[PDB]
Ligand binder design. Structure first.
Ligand SMILES: Nc1nc(=O)c2cc(CCCCc3cnc(C(=O)N[C@@H](CCC(=O)O)C(=O)O)c(F)c3)sc2[nH]1
Ligand SMILES: NCC(=O)N[C@@H]1O[C@H](COP(=O)([O-])[O-])[C@@H](O)[C@H]1O
Length: 200
């Protein structure tokens, strides 16, 4: 399975995905890394691993649909089968999401459906949970509401901050995201016609 990884930032999840897909038994190959922001650290991790990169500045486009179309063009150029959103922060448009339905995965740093949106850790800390986690799900049109593939709980320790909590949660992200990609890449898991997770 040919994979594109979209990033907006540091690329720790990207790096975990690079490491896992180099394993001999990997069912996925990362063929392109797309960033919507220039000179982010994930672009370096990609070049060090010998993976093509492309910056598609969202700031240059009239609206989401145009910008998504620019991404889609690169996805076709590279005959991509699966899209991983790994720290990619731009909400995608309906048509793009529908096109990639069942082929696009996103990592989210909470146990969905808790704490959807961009600042999950802040919410988690403000709410006072003692267990949080991360969620790999298919991208549906409703942000952070697509079908759930894997999750891993992570404890909240007293005194935690966004810095310390997100650091612990990212250790789980680097486990379940490579695992979720391998499940989809190998056809073990797919989005069902009824729209629920299907473990073939
Ligand atoms: N249809 C669809 N379904 C999905 O499940 C899904 C998941 C995605 C992964 C991205 C993370 C989820 C998320 C993204 N973005 C924002 C946000 O407010 N983003 C600002 C830009 C802020 C910035 O640039 O840092 C904006 O895009 O306007 C947010 F609150 C939460 S994208 C997507 N699209
Ligand atoms: N709303 C989406 C979101 O919060 N994404 C989060 O951004 C980080 C990216 O880190 P990375 O750039 O080191 O992979 C990850 O912690 C991921 O869960």
């Amino acid at each position: 399975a040919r994979v594109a990884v979209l990033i907006s930032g540091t690329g720790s999840n990207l790096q975990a995905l690079i490491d896992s897909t180099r394993e001999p038994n990997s069912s996925a190959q990362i063929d392109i890394v797309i960033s919507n922001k220039a000179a982010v650290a994930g672009l370096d991790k990609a070049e060090r691993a010998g993976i093509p990169t492309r910056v598609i500045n969202h700031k240059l486009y009239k609206n989401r649909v145009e910008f998504d179309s620019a991404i889609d063009l690169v996805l076709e150029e590279f005959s991509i089968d699966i899209v991983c959103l790994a720290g990619f922060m731009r909400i995608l448009s309906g048509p793009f999401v529908a096109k990639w339905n069942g082929k696009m995965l996103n990592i989210h740093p909470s146990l969905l459906p808790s704490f959807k949106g961009s600042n999950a850790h802040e919410q988690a800390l403000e709410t006072g949970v003692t267990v949080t986690g991360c969620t790999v799900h298919f991208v549906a049109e409703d942000v952070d509401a697509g079908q759930i593939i894997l999750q891993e709980a992570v404890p909240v320790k007293r005194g935690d901050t966004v810095a310390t909590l997100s650091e612990r949660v990212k250790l789980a992200e680097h486990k379940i995201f490579p695992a979720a990609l391998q499940l989809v890449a190998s056809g073990t898991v797919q989005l069902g016609e009824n729209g629920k997770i299907c473990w073939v």
